[PDB]
Amino acid sequence: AYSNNSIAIPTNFTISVTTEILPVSMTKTSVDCTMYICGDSTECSNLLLQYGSFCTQLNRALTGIAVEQDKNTQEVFAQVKQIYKTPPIKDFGGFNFSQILPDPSKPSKRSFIEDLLFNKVTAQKFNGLTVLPPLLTDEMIAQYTSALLAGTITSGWTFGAGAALQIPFAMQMAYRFNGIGVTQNVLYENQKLIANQFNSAIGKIQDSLSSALGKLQDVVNQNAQALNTLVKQLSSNFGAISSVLNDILSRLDPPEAEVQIDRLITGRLQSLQTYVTQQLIRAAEIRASANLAATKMSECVLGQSKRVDFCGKGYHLMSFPQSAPHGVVFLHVTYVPAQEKNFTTAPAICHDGKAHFPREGVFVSNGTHWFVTQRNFYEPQIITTDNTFVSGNCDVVIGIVNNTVYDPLQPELD
Amino acid sequence: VVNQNAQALNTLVKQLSSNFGAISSVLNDILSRLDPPEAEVQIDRLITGRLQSLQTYVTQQLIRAAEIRASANLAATKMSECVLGQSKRVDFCGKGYHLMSFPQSAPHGVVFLHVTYVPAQEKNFTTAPAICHDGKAHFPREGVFVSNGTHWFVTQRNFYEPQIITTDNTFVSGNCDVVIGIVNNTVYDPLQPELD
Amino acid sequence: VAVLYQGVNCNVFQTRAGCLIGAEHVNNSYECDIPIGAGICASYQTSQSIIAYTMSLGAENSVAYSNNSIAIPTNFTISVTTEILPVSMTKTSVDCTMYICGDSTECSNLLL
Ligand SMILES: *[C@@H]1O[C@H](CO)[C@@H](O[C@@H]2O[C@H](CO)[C@@H](O)[C@H](O)[C@H]2NC(C)=O)[C@H](O)[C@H]1NC(C)=O
Ligand SMILES: *[C@@H]1O[C@H](CO)[C@@H](O)[C@H](O)[C@H]1NC(C)=O
Ligand SMILES: *[C@@H]1O[C@H](CO)[C@@H](O)[C@H](O)[C@H]1NC(C)=O
Ligand SMILES: *[C@@H]1O[C@H](CO)[C@@H](O)[C@H](O)[C@H]1NC(C)=O
Ligand SMILES: *[C@@H]1O[C@H](CO)[C@@H](O)[C@H](O)[C@H]1NC(C)=O
Ligand SMILES: *[C@@H]1O[C@H](CO)[C@@H](O)[C@H](O)[C@H]1NC(C)=O
Ligand SMILES: *[C@@H]1O[C@H](CO)[C@@H](O)[C@H](O)[C@H]1NC(C)=O
Ligand SMILES: *[C@@H]1O[C@H](CO)[C@@H](O)[C@H](O)[C@H]1NC(C)=O
Ligand SMILES: *[C@@H]1O[C@H](CO)[C@@H](O)[C@H](O)[C@H]1NC(C)=O
């Protein structure tokens, strides 16, 4: 229902925690050029000398892809070069943080949620398909995620722009409310309710991740499928008589075998060209996912964002990053007002003959009453001379009513 | 970028010298060592090999152009956000707090120069979330209450500046029983001697 | 030099990257300099030689957390920083006739 004289104001609010997943890197692979076309044959190298520039381009291109996974891993999990210790005392005002911070007695340095994500996560070398291992282990990555998680719980946002500064958590959350337009007294009046809502939403997340991940197994699926695709090409002919070079060499002198060897060479070289171009496109797609995740790391975690729907859904408060195989997991802590009530409203108020405009609030009315409240939450205040400012007369305002203003200087006259 | 272009050109030039299975790479030697009806297979092998080289060169240049355009759009957004006005995004106009920025030209590119605002030294202090005067709670307007341990002040959240606590720096919104951490300390009203 | 192998299981130093020949393993860890893989970073320090060590994560510092104490900056600095970005690349054009065919008529006929 839309009207020219009405407004509805939030009265309660709820907190909720939202998950989003993004891939960060992908399996590194290096494919020899000679071995794939030629096994242990000496004559198979000689016919390949004419195309030596193709082997040098194909070996250089997978190296240039190989360094990109190292830059993608090195740009998201490293916004600080200081490892912040984790305090022993665990009282943070009633906000129970026993799930995202890692328990010391655990033998691995993951916490509980990283293990749930680790359990959800799902000879080849003879043909020359080598897999190189990533530069960083999951324990050192988990050391970086533990430093980043500790820095928001200890220093707020002023540790990634400068040297760390301590601050209790009770003022950190009130600093986050004034950034979205809410007075801080709503935090100080209802801390136990939000703390138990935050603990219940963490338990809801533990139940939701345990019941999904459709964007972190596919990137492994594409590489494993494409590798089996290059495997099956070893048994194709291309209009040849056999699929094994030593069988051609064992049965027919080399001059009477060059017509089969060149026909196998062009086909296998063409399949290498296909595999290399497919890896270049997927690597560029990963580069795009990596730069976007690095911006979310430097935007949601450090500082607070003024962009609607950049971190979660709702008015963003905090984030808590986690680490899982080949990808990051963000945990946004949004704020969503709940109950509302319809009310009569007015742009301005005339009293003395001067238009009284509200400072930071909006004028509301209950019929018998006239109050002012903050835009994003209900709290009724009487009209005073410290809550409005005067400007001009009352004839230029289309919608104005009459109501008396109490001067707080009346007892000052007594 | 200059290195990548000079390699991509040099490989095109080097591929001219390979026969790709032929008995010579010089077209005039093909036309002199066979009749064209029998030299068409050597010419077609050179045609297929040079077309494969040109195909790979073109695909490589299409690939590089898309990344260069992505970097140009990123520099455009830094041009309209770092140079003009301030941003409130941290780690997107250089380390720490950013004030203004200064574009400088460079061959195939641009160099930005930020002016960063970084705190340095600090001092330890005993805080309080809120202060109970006479039944009412006094929350600071935008400050945070600090105290050396013998005097209580209020200041901004990023720079030291002691100021005497006053009724014009706090607003009341209830009582003291709903707030844990509140201390007992009186508040000065500067208007009382003005009434005398 | 120090020759490193990838899949070869053998100053021999055996790692998860392969077999490492010609580097003296030490227990003193440093900031990474030359990355090899699996957490191994080599350097040329003390006599000085090609040494092998497990990388050192960031730098340690103590954190101080209280339930009633705050820290307020009292001095500030001004500095400048640089960021380099490429905006364009060299424009090139290649003719489909001259590259494929030098001087010849049937080489143009075959390309119809
Ligand atoms: C705003 O919503 C919260 C959460 O529902 C309310 O908190 C509950 O209040 C009732 C009061 O009887 C308690 O029994 C519950 O335990 C509280 N929390 C839960 C888990 O629901 C709060 O009272 C609501 N406030 C308003 C203004 O209605
Ligand atoms: C936090 O929750 C866990 C799991 O229920 C519990 O074992 C722990 O004691 C709780 N800690 C606090 C501070 O209540
Ligand atoms: C708004 O509240 C008034 C006062 O109770 C009531 O008369 C009216 O029906 C309400 N309007 C809506 C939108 O329900
Ligand atoms: C608001 O709408 C009502 C019903 O159409 C109308 O009578 C009244 O004049 C309107 N007031 C303004 C300020 O437009
Ligand atoms: C406010 O009071 C003036 C003077 O009596 C009157 O002319 C005007 O119509 C009133 N407006 C209302 C009813 O809000
Ligand atoms: C800090 O914690 C200690 C131990 O629980 C407690 O005695 C003290 O009152 C707390 N101080 C504040 C202001 O929270
Ligand atoms: C503060 O003063 C009130 C009233 O005298 C008293 O009841 C309360 O215990 C005092 N609290 C402290 C912290 O001294
Ligand atoms: C290397 O070989 C030795 C002897 O067979 C064996 O004990 C060891 O486990 C092997 N290590 C690896 C990395 O395979
Ligand atoms: C810190 O600030 C004071 C007062 O402005 C000044 O005297 C002192 O030289 C400054 N120190 C530094 C680190 O520049």
Contact A356, A383 (CB under 8 A): yes
Of A258, A230, A255, A232, nearest to A245 by C-alpha is: A258
Contact check, Cβ <8 Å, B119/C101: no
Distance CA A362, CA A347 (A): 8
Q: Exposed, middle or buried, A149 (CB in 10 Å: 0-12/13-18/19+)?
A: buried
Contact B172, B120 (CB under 8 A): no
Distance CA A268, CA A265 (A): 5
Dihedral sign for Cα A163, A167, A171, A176, please: positive
Dihedral sign for Cα A281, A283, A285, A288, please: negative
Distance CA A27, CA B31 (A): 51
Contact C101, C111 (CB under 8 A): yes
Q: How far A188 CA sits from the closest chain B CA (Å)?
A: 6
* Residue C87 contacts B where some CB pair is shorter than 8 Å: yes
Protein residues whose CB sits closer than 6 Å to any atom of ligand 2: A 96, 98
Contact A216, A226 (CB under 8 A): no
Interface test with B, best of A53, A268, A301, A382 (most B CBs within 10 A): A53
Describe the crossing of helices B2-14 and B36-78 by its angle, rounded to 10 degrees.
Answer: 180
List, as own/partner pairs, every contact residues B6-10 make where C-beta atoms lie below 8 angstroms and the sequence separation is at least 24, other chains included. B8/B57, B8/B60, B8/B61, B9/C92
Choosing from A342, A343, A345, A366 the residue with most ligand 3 atoms within 8 A of its CB, the one to mutate for a pocket test is A342
Q: Please tell me the total number of residues recorded for chain C in this structure.
A: 112
Tokens of B42: 């050597």
Residue A338 vs residues A12, A108, A190, B11, C97: alpha-carbon distances, Å: 5, 40, 15, 65, 71
Distance CA B174, CA A307 (A): 33
Helix H segments across A313-410? none
Structure letter (DSSP) for residue B135? S
For residue A315, give the H/E element and its range: strand A315-319
Map residue A271 onto helix, strand or coil: helix
Q: Tokens 């060149």 map to which residue? A: A262
HSE-up of A240 (CA within 13 Å, CB side)? 23
Distance CA A173, CA A187 (A): 8
Contact C93, B18 (CB under 8 A): no
DSSP result, A9-59: EE--EEEEEEEEEE-----EEEE-SHHHH-SS-SHHHHTTGGGHHHHHHHH
Bridging pattern class, strands C12-14 and C19-21: antiparallel
> A272 — phi, psi (to 5°)?
-70, -35
Tokens of C83: 């960021």
Distance CA A171, CA A189 (A): 13
Contact A45, A38 (CB under 8 A): yes
Contact check, Cβ <8 Å, A185/B139: yes
Distance CA B84, CA A276 (A): 42
Of A4, A74, A326, A50, nearest to C32 by C-alpha is: A74
* Residue B18 contacts A where some CB pair is shorter than 8 Å: yes
Can you count the helices (H) and strands (E) in chain B? 4, 10
Distance CA C17, CA C3 (A): 12
Tokens of A66: 């190989």
Amino acid, res. A38: C
HSE-up of B144 (CA within 13 Å, CB side)? 24
Gap sites in chain A (C to N > 2.5 Å), preceding residue numbers: 122, 211
Q: Which residues contact residue A313 at a Cβ distance below 8 angstroms, ignoring those fewer than 6 apart?
A: A18, A334
Distance CA A311, CA B142 (A): 26
Question: By alpha-carbon position, which residue is closest to atom 12 of ligand 3?
Answer: A342
Contact A406, A349 (CB under 8 A): no
Contact check, Cβ <8 Å, A166/C60: no
Q: Which residues contact residue A41 at a Cβ distance below 8 angstroms, ignoring those fewer than 6 apart?
A: A245, A246, A249
What's CA A275's distance to the chain center, in Å? 30
DSSP result, A201-218: HHHHHHHHHT----SSSH
Q: Tokens 């291309």 map to which residue? A: A238
Contact B91, A79 (CB under 8 A): yes
E strands of A116-191, at which residues?
Answer: 129-132
Contact B188, A198 (CB under 8 A): no
Q: Which residues contact residue B143 at a Cβ distance below 8 angstroms, ignoring those fewer than 6 apart?
A: B154, B155, B156, B157, B163, B169
Interface of B with C in 112-141 (CB under 8 A): 112-128
Contact A135, A70 (CB under 8 A): yes
Distance CA A396, CA A115 (A): 65
For residue A146, give the H/E element and its range: helix A138-154
Of A199, A109, A119, nearest to A146 by C-alpha is: A109
- Cα B77–Cα B80–Cα B82 angle in degrees, nearest 5: 90
E strands of A183-227, at which residues?
Answer: none
Bridging pattern class, strands A83-84 and C60-61: parallel
Map residue B152 onto helix, strand or coil: strand
Other Cβ atoms within 10 Å of A261 Cβ, number: 22
C106 to chain B: which residues are within 8 Å by CB? 36, 40, 43
Structure letter (DSSP) for residue B159? B
A134 to chain C: which residues are within 8 Å by CB? 37
Distance CA B137, CA B123 (A): 27
Helix, strand, coil fractions of chain B, as percent rounded to 5: 40, 25, 35
Distance CA C21, CA A107 (A): 32
Tokens of B4: 């990548």
Contact B25, B17 (CB under 8 A): yes
Contact B164, B153 (CB under 8 A): yes
Contact A330, A302 (CB under 8 A): no
**Closest CA in chain B for residue A302:** B90
Helix H segments across A218-257? 218-232, 245-251
Distance CA A289, CA B94 (A): 21
Q: Tokens 């001092």 map to which residue? A: B123
Of A277, A276, A282, A279, nearest to A33 by C-alpha is: A276
CA Rg, chain A, in Å? Answer: 33
Of A375, A396, A386, A329, nearest to A115 by C-alpha is: A329
E strands of C46-111, at which residues?
Answer: 49-54, 60-61, 69-73, 76-85
For chain C, the farthest-separated pair of C-alpha atoms sits apart, in whole angstroms, at: 91
HSE-up of A81 (CA within 13 Å, CB side)? 5
Tokens of A159: 């540790």
Question: By alpha-carbon position, which residue is closest to atom 4 of ligand 4?
Answer: A4
Q: What is the dihedral of CA A62, C18, A76, A61, to 10 degrees?
A: -10
Map residue B186 onto helix, strand or coil: coil
DSSP result, A295-315: HHIIIIISS---STTSSSSSE
Distance CA B144, CA B157 (A): 7
Of A401, A408, A409, A407, nearest to A363 by C-alpha is: A401
**Closest CA in chain C for residue A93:** C67
Distance CA B50, CA B23 (A): 15
Distance CA B4, CA C79 (A): 34
C97 to chain B: which residues are within 8 Å by CB? none
Q: Which residues contact residue C94 at a Cβ distance below 8 angstroms, ignoring those fewer than 6 apart?
A: B12, B54, B57
**Closest CA in chain A for residue C40:** A135
